[PDB]
Design a protein around this nucleic acid. Structure first.
Ligand SMILES: [Cl-]
Ligand SMILES: [Zn+2]
Ligand SMILES: [Zn+2]
Ligand SMILES: [Zn+2]
Ligand SMILES: [Zn+2]
Ligand SMILES: [Zn+2]
Ligand SMILES: [Zn+2]
Ligand SMILES: [Zn+2]
Ligand SMILES: [Zn+2]
Lengths: 54, 52
DNA sequence: TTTGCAGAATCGATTCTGCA
DNA sequence: AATGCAGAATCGATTCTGCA
């Protein structure tokens, strides 16, 4: 589907809905190699690298 | 009135002392419903309003 | 159509400031 | 002057979206 069971928002793809769901479940598949930081979305990890590891 | 972490200036020593918590992470405001702790009162107040 | 990059927008959480 | 409450202003870690 494309509607969130938690917050009711509708998304443009099933693909992004499933990414969006992590925000409510806690699931965070992108692990920082350098610390114990994890992120739901690639961009959060990328920012985390640029700012805490430099 | 000057902070030694960030160099910023403030209007008073009272507020400088509160400002330092943002760096030191001393968080005297404490939620009696979750392990949430804050440096400034407004943060604890916001926290109570939407969580509890 | 489904997946993905990339970076701007968002808005929760915090800091700053007007006034007492 | 020093303290303090309250909300305006700001910030930034994440979400969302133009594009491919
Ligand atoms: Cl304390
Ligand atoms: Zn949702
Ligand atoms: Zn969208
Ligand atoms: Zn890291
Ligand atoms: Zn580090
Ligand atoms: Zn400072
Ligand atoms: Zn709490
Ligand atoms: Zn929360
Ligand atoms: Zn910003």
């Amino acid at each position: 589907s494309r509607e969130c069971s938690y917050c009711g928002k509708f998304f443009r793809s099933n693909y992004y809905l499933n990414i969006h769901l992590r925000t409510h479940t806690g699931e965070k598949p992108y692990k920082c190699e350098f610390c114990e930081y994890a992120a739901a979305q690639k961009t959060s990890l990328r920012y985390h690298l640029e700012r805490h590891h430099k």
